[PDB]
Design a protein around this ligand. Structure first.
Ligand SMILES: OC[C@H]1O[C@@H](O[C@@H]2[C@@H](O)[C@H](O[C@@H]3[C@@H](O)[C@H](O)O[C@H](CO)[C@H]3O)O[C@H](CO)[C@H]2O)[C@H](O)[C@@H](O)[C@@H]1O
Ligand SMILES: OC[C@H]1O[C@@H](O[C@@H]2[C@@H](O)[C@H](O)O[C@H](CO)[C@H]2O)[C@H](O)[C@@H](O)[C@@H]1O
Ligand SMILES: [Cl-]
Length: 251
């Protein structure tokens, strides 16, 4: 009788043929879209199908998301939320380097802000350890509202344990899950059938974005890396641009 309203589209740059409105039935479960960039989602309509776009400075600077244009693009587009670096914990960016960069470039955006998306790694100096060290390096000078998690693994049990552990270890922070799926060789439908009602019940999870809101054909053509690690089971769209068996869970 009232949607949890936590679901979002992780929307790749190559999605010009696809329509985000296909996965928005107006009920209010799907509310957000991000595209790993600070330019608007490329779509078949030129719109976001009624979804709120979250700008993302996923690199420290790029040709596609120039950090010198970050403040400009927020003002032009009127984001209510911004995401920062994508997986700096496995991209040779020290917590101290991320903290300095975040204070210079993300702090000035007077809207809701997420700390960088970290991987689910527990290997030395990665994942939540990296995040804890970045918050220490921030020395109280980073303005943020959310922590940002990725998870890829082999069971719902592992995912539930990871989110409960993340909450237990950061009990005063609201969580965005900007990417999650099983790795290749599982049943992605069964995973998301378990994950959605689990996440919908957690007050401390603001948003979750299944990897990935595209078709298998587009993922294979443009992200062979993701296909080798995740497979094509978690694609929300059919190759025609309708909802997949995972897309159908978004409604
Ligand atoms: O040069 C081709 C094209 O590159 C685009 O930049 C892309 C990023 O947009 C892309 O972003 C996502 C990844 O960060 C994430 O890991 O996977 C998703 C789903 O596949 C990606 O969409 O990351 C790649 C590098 O992995 C970049 O090449 C530019 O935005 C675009 O202007 C340009 O035409
Ligand atoms: O992210 C925390 C909050 O940040 C706010 O913007 C900050 C300003 O209040 C403060 O005066 O300056 C800093 C640095 O320029 C800003 O980041 C947002 O307005 C809030 O929405 C947000 O919750
Ligand atoms: Cl991960």
């Amino acid at each position: 009788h009232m949607a949890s309203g936590k679901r979002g589209l992780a929307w790749p740059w190559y999605n010009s043929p696809l329509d985000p409105g296909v996965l928005n039935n107006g009920d209010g479960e799907v509310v957000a879209i991000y595209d790993w960039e600070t330019y608007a989602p490329p779509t078949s309509t030129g719109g976001t199908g009624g979804l709120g776009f979250i700008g993302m400075q996923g690199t420290m600077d790029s040709d596609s998301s120039p950090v010198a244009q970050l403040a400009t693009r927020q003002a032009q587009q009127g984001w209510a939320t911004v995401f920062s670096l994508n997986e700096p914990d496995i991209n040779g960016i020290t917590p101290a380097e991320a903290a300095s960069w975040y204070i210079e470039w993300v702090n000035p955006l007077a809207i809701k802000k997420a700390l960088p998306a970290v991987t689910s790694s527990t290997t030395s100096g990665q994942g939540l350890s990296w995040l804890s060290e970045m918050i220490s390096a921030c020395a109280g000078a980073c303005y943020f509202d959310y922590i940002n998690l990725h998870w890829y693994g082999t069971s719902f049990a592992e995912f539930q344990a990871y989110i409960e552990q993340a909450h237990n270890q950061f009990p005063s922070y609201t969580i965005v899950i900007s990417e999650f799926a099983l790795t290749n060789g599982g049943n992605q439908v069964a995973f998301f059938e378990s994950a959605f009602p689990f996440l919908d019940g957690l007050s401390y999870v603001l948003l979750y974005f299944p990897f990935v809101a595209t078709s298998p054909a587009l993922l294979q053509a443009n992200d062979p890396g993701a296909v080798t690690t995740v497979g094509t089971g978690s694609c929300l769209y059919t190759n025609a641009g309708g909802p997949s068996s995972v897309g159908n869970l978004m409604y």
